[PDB]
């Protein structure tokens, strides 16, 4: 069975355990339990669906198919998470 699905669904596993460890090191965490990574993947996914849903709404209002950075800045500012350095 060489053939398989073209699309990939485990892209939340692409946020690897060393990446989450580096994020915790930047946050100042010395010791990390083994169940941290699944919870971090879940909260990152929830945050990303919120921001991406608002940015897709901003894109669809402008009758566009691409998602610009300015829509992402709008979506983050609407959630009280203003980001500097991408225009505006």
């Amino acid at each position: 069975a060489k053939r398989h699905r073209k699309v990939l669904r485990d892209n939340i596993q692409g946020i690897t355990k060393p990446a989450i460890r580096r994020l915790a090191r930047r946050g100042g965490v010395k010791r990390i339990s083994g169940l941290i990574y699944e919870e971090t993947r879940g909260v990152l996914k929830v945050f990303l669906e919120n921001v991406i849903r608002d940015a897709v709404t901003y894109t669809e209002h402008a009758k566009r198919k691409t998602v610009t950075a300015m829509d992402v800045v709008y979506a983050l500012k609407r959630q009280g998470r203003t980001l500097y350095g991408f225009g505006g």
Binding site: A1, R3, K6, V7
Partner: protein, 769 residues
Amino acid sequence: KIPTRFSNRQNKTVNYNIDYSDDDLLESEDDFHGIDIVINHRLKTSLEEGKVLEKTVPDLNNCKENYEFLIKWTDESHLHNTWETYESIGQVRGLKRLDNYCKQFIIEDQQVRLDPYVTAEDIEIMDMERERRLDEFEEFHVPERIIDSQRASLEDGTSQLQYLVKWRRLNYDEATWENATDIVKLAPEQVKHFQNRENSKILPQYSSNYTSQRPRFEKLSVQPPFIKGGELRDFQLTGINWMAFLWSKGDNGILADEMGLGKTVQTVAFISWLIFARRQNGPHIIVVPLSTMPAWLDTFEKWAPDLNCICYMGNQKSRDTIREYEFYTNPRAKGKKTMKFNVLLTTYEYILKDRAELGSIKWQFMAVDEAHRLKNAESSLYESLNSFKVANRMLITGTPLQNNIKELAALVNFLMPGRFTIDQEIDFENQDEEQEEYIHDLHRRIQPFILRRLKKDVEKSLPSKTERILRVELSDVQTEYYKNILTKNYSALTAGAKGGHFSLLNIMNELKKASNHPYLFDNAEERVLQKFGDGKMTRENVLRGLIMSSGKMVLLDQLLTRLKKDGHRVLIFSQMVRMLDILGDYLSIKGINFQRLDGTVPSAQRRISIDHFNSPDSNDFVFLLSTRAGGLGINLMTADTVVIFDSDWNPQADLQAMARAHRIGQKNHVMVYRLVSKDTVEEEVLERARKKMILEYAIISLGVTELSAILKFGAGNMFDVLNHAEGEEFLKQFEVTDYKADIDWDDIIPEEELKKLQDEEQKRKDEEY
């Protein structure tokens, strides 16, 4: 100067220095011989006790005292490899390397030896790759080049001569200091080559200073004495005379000969002529692809053994070793450093990686192999090589024009930056005399700068190659997928898919996927299995579903059966590796000894599969290929038939695809079958391919070493049938041969094949597994 504005806010001062030191954290911090490579093992540790106890499996403790392992230690020279034992080692670094070696190698060795489910093919391929591993490790014992010699003081050993030795298949990072005695007792030819290179009579500092004062070149009808080699042919000497006459005029050039003619032999003979005859023994640079690198190294070692040809690959430490031990005659100095080498071989990756360490070298000649990679002016290799201070450049390629005139404009701008300019394209809808005058002006402009020798003008033993274009209809599934994509039907394209994630970005790519096979799309095989084969999927209806799903490969099934009845081997080229997976599964359920090649296969398994296909006792019948992989360094001498399943946008890829079996000296007539879907999006792909062939026959083929007729042929539209037998010759292999299959559901899977499949299914059900 002074700030004109200040802050009146009385905030406290803040030290913003984020730099830190871990010297306070040294309380738990810090304030070369060990096992490196295990090569071979022997079943007798000290002596053979007997042939008893040959059954069962041994554990790790049993294998600790029963086997001796060949060890190359850390920072050694692959000649002090010792047959050691676990109790003879003690506790050194890298012991767990030997633990992993012994453990898992003995586990799958005894597993494949004790398994009754082992075929002969698996044991012979693993034995053959084991032998390849064994003599690949044994090749490291042979030295290849001596870099430097020194006098070193050992432990009360007075003064000893010590050589820097490089080995055969390894790099300069592992080059070792070794004794002189075993080196001169092993291979004294490399030693005397080293003393010849030490007080050599040819240096870059002794080169001539020809500044637009080069002498005239007389034609040579005899092989020069300083190029020993083997035998140099007449067309090679003609190319030598052409390159020498181009260098005498101070002009750059393109050696546009076909592959297989020995362009490497021609350019090594030209480099030897420049070094020896014209006394231009200065620093030369040759940029080659990585896959063709040993084919240039052995040519330098054979044809011009007196040259100081050096190699440039490796990591940062190997390139540092080459840079600081071998570039300069006097690297210990601080002023101007003269060059010690003569020719430097490198690849594109280390041209871009080491622009700064190579651009400050007064090169005398540049030779760039496979110049079509340099076809883009905006690619980073173009600005990397165009910034080099080189007086004379030369481009070696097989396809000078690939898609348009702009590629040739980029090549002639890299060669002569300013003399040649091109500002107009070619329009087939114009058909005016000004375009023909422009074509003739381009013919008369780059005529002495292009030397192209065909495979038919020289070596008059090549069998002809015939390309047949086969246009086949579509299935009902292919037609409904084509109308669903073209008239976008996301609700209908979802249908029974649970995910429902259909991406219609790049519409034409999805149209090509629908024209190739419906099973490339996700959740598409289940509808065919539940609509025609009623969802049982019991080892027989799945092959029939593969047959009826794609309208292309029923003709491929008929062709493979017809060429199975004949004594020929077939290559199948494709653009997508998922379609190659579809054919691999089709041959797996079909049960045909097949081999596969794509980009995911590493080069060792590539070499394994090529040697398995090219053996005289090969049981392989069909070889699947991805079209744009491997370059020109793949030989398919045993192949006879080439089937282009998917056409390429650049037809030079198709020519190099069908040139894998159509090499020099082929003993059979090469037949090419192209599988094209009727009334689909591939027709304009074939139209653009035929337009590029018309452009290639116009500019390149008529200016080697009736224009309106081929212009009108390119302006038009191109839109006993599988027999393996066969100006106006250029018009051939362009007609479209329509094929009528009319194969229904019950015609495929005949009685003998279905009976064999049912017997195999019953044998698998009886034996379980």
